[PDB]
Symmetry: D3
Subunit: 251 residues, 6 copies
């Protein structure tokens, strides 16, 4: 198996069975049409790849991802058929990460916004920098938060924190995110990647079935909320034809 079907992504296989997946693109790793599809569809390939034992996922440089690019949001608003495509991709990103038994570790440095946040937060283990900026962003942009949060935030931070950050879109930094249960760990910015790599390395060298089946069991908690998640997806893509988003991209 080769990761050439995913040309927007940089996939590197170490000797320990860790696959590094890097988001590397302009505008602090913004997610364009090709990356949005690649992020969605890579997971079932990784999960059938016998050479891979763990995934380490990150952005290049001092940033996870600023999320969807101007062009991606444009297409979503201005074209039905493209909207439908991008919607299916948003759905599958969540469904495929959640159904991937291979453990995943995220190293979150700088911003993680929208589609980028999905990947950051649906990793099994998430490592955030003290100063990392975790931004769901949807309500301020003017659309419903339908790309992951309804499937997991309550079961990460409890309903009172979830409602607060998701409705207000107040900025949440890695240190406070760790305090409230959104991420597994918080470490100094400079140590985010090495901390994550070590965990990923340990998982890769661990007892495989034990690890994967533990993951899989726990993931039933998210899968049970699949219909609630897909409601949120529908409502988000509906809202993309609404007035507010026009003002929202302008700001």
């Amino acid at each position: 198996v080769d990761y050439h079907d995913f040309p927007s992504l940089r996939c590197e296989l170490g000797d320990d069975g860790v696959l590094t997946v890097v988001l590397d693109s302009p505008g602090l790793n913004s997610v364009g049409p090709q990356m949005h599809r690649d992020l969605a569809d890579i997971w079932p390939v990784i999960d059938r790849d016998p050479a891979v034992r763990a995934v380490l996922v990150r952005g290049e440089g001092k940033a996870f991802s600023s999320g969807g690019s101007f062009d991606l949001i444009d297409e979503t608003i201005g074209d039905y058929q493209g909207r439908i495509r991008i919607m299916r991709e948003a759905r599958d990103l969540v469904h495929n990460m959640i159904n991937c038994d291979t453990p995943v570790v995220s190293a979150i440095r700088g911003p993680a916004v929208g589609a980028g946040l999905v990947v950051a937060l649906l990793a099994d283990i998430s490592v955030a920098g003290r100063t990392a900026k975790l931004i769901d962003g949807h309500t301020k942009l003017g659309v419903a938060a339908g790309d992951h949060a309804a499937i997991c935030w309550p079961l990460l931070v409890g309903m009172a924190k979830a409602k607060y950050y998701l409705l207000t879109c107040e900025t949440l930094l890695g240190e406070e995110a760790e305090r409230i249960g959104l991420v597994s760990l918080c470490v100094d910015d400079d140590d985010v990647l090495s901390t994550a790599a070590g965990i990923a390395g340990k998982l890769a060298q661990g007892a495989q079935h034990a690890i994967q089946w533990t993951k899989r069991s726990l993931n039933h908690w998210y899968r049970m909320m699949g219909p609630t998640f897909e409601t949120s997806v529908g409502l988000e893509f509906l809202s993309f034809s609404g007035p507010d988003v026009q003002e929202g991209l302008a700001a």
Copy 2:
């Protein structure tokens, strides 16, 4: 739309599209029979009022609510028909808040007990003062905790904390409440009201569908526990016919500590 159908409630529409809903009654805003119905029934009306874009709910003065009045409890204990009316109101309060798409911010100062705590905690964004007193209160009175906690607490503070506080009825202060995830925010007592108004104002001026649909999606987590919550409701209202609640009431009126066993 006018809020005259809810005479125990003072409702004030702001310039900002925020409806302030004030609980104001004697005994630190105790909830009597009219207010129990009014609290239960107002939400569906609020939700269809095109002039309202957010709700700020609070108590008059420096108290949220002491919960059900002695008259309310007496009626529950002593009369079948009244018990069922109250039970329907208890159930609908939770169901109607949770099905209300309009965002709600609570400003929690002083005590928020029983039926008052329901409203304080089912608000989307709850703002508690450092020394605010959050008291479910049911097991110490001698009845099951069936008025909201079973639909939400484990998804607020996790099961180990839910069980500790709901079973022992130990008082929980605002600061500790925020630490463990029960409320959205903890501020100084003198800042609760302006902080809550700030948040309500900002939601009212935001992307309406985005906000309402996000909230609605999140509320499915509570909706999926309706049957569990309705179990808790039946168990509480059944326990009102038991001897323990008579003792709890009697102990209170008699200024002593309850002896249940």
Copy 3:
């Protein structure tokens, strides 16, 4: 009602209607074949005993329980009918504790591991010492975490913390456990027992139906995850026939999977 049908467990009924259930056995209160069955089957009996109004469950000495003994694991690996018997006990432990309406307080000093952690955490109110060691332990041994965690951890600590600790098997100390929501209370190691006995005592003097029906209502959150729990059980017991557990057990005699 006589607790003589559970010979590996010491059961002492106080004046206050508190049943103290002590776990006391070699290797830090390890759970052998008899205790595994006793711990599973004791709860329905306690739940129907009118002399009991609360349970306080603890380890003898400065340990809660190290979980499965080497012999119990050996049988699980070596013998099919034994494995099935044990798997049924594992499932029943969780099911029974969760359907016990009588309130249960755990006093956690020292290690609570595997089967030991199950009982410590499915108590209604868990009191952990500052340095108590809470270790699920499954992935480190080479088996799926199928003995309780999948029914409850996401709803105790949130999924990010649940995965961290269940996948890595990093040790969790009672103070940190309390911070992230795994346990009800953290007190000084020297104050664990009295804090817990005090809590059991209050519960046992409380309004019985109110307390029991509140617990029951709350327990529906775990009961709706039964199929997810039973999934994890099967995956654990399937993985007992895998190579990794032979390596993981050998490692703990003398860890390279």
Copy 4:
């Protein structure tokens, strides 16, 4: 007061039975006003102490042909209208299922789309042998998001739900009873009397016993709320798609659609 719902004729009987009548042109088509009134009447009925049961029917020999040409046209061509219709669709199902007052439906002739929603979410549905029960969504070119995803598998089993909802083959009242979709099948002439009898007997019954039995059973539908809401969203997304123009053209032209 029921004058808040001017599209619907609401007649209170001596027995405590509220009769609710869908009376309009094109075999009781549901236009803008009726779509909202149908959605919003149930919580008011539920809180009315005069009412102990509901009998719901169409005027004459028809239940409802469903959405009128106008209502569909709005859904297709106007955004804010589409949202208002969407909310209404969601609320009809949600409000019917949360109405504790028992509801009996008298199904004669066509019961299509929006009209079918009311006919099938009734607690007790009485179908004439020749009644035509038609979901209609895939044939019209939109997802079936107005009620079927919340109940059909639990009425007819997933094999029949898939067959009828995907193909949109017509279901006659007789075959509908055989497969579990409706409570009872009778001769077209007895539908109305059979239904009124049942409404009457429930209205005379033990009020809490009946309302609480129905509430309990309705949890099976409530637990499917998020699945239903997915279906609503998808139906309303599909209304911006290319198929529905051709689907409505095809309907209006008494011909088979060419997608």
Copy 5:
């Protein structure tokens, strides 16, 4: 030994089938002791190595007419008794559902209320053509909260479930089988022998296979536990209402 259940006659055959018979005046009416015994037997059966299947039936030509007048009176008239009867009603459904041993019911004549519970929660139910299946609760003036909310929609679909449970119209075995409420309908005289045969074959089958198939299918009911327990609470509340005192008399509310 089943001596802890004095109201029930339990006979173990040479094939591993444990026959459980309800035998009591008034067509096997279920009194205080029977109500507790029926609730508390299944966990014992399920850990009994000698038992491989259960065959449950009434004595004579009747399954059970349900709770007796005195059991009902107790529910109406006293709180501690009402609560005990409630725990029993709830554990009956729970304990049958959690019993991995397969259970065949042989239903002849009436099966009403508490007795219908056992009839329908058996894994395989055999009804006679003229067996009378009567949930009975609304006719009696209480919510139907002793089992139907955990199973009927998944047996007969919601339209049929609502019709029979709201009206309490009598449902005969032949019609019960057609709508999917019972596994099988046979001629009245063949009920017991058809049921015994089925239980016999099950007692001889591959044990883990059978029990685990059944267990897995039972999750469909376990997931509906809270909805069931909602219906239990609603039934027991309604026993304090006015309707039931009249309904026990009979039927005019």
Copy 6:
């Protein structure tokens, strides 16, 4: 796209946008090692194929599938890694079919057993021959019914019929299967194939999103039973290490 990654299955793309998936193998289309994997992994590929608008799935000749082959059963009992590989495939077959938005029609003639019955019944629309034999078969073989039945039978035939057939393994013929709700339709054996094709063709010509989104919404009723289904998978594959399936196999 490339159906050559599925060596055990014959995939033919029609003019009407219908992909016909033929199960054509020894022993009345028995499912061996290669077919068990191919059946599991094909569905996500189909669902992403823009050339395909509907699937017609069928066995070669007058038989759907006799299910898992002797070798597959021997591999399940005999070897741990292979047992685990087979278990994953059983799990994913059910998971992937139910998550495939593309409408699927099954044409059921003669026997459809175990692993074949899976594909047959999780088709959106199943067309059954009057004398087609639908056999779950797991209790007769000595293993828990963990390959699909626990995700769907109660919502097909109701619990009383589910427990009768799955516990006893009594034979269920296509006519009776339709009566009780297990299959969409029952036609004469000779008409199964053309009836299935017609239905596939119509669906393939329909409003694509309308159909796919309706089926997806309905399929949530199955996704919500995923953990019950996975419990059953687990109990089946555990029971393969038991003493019972030795005799069970030796018989057939």
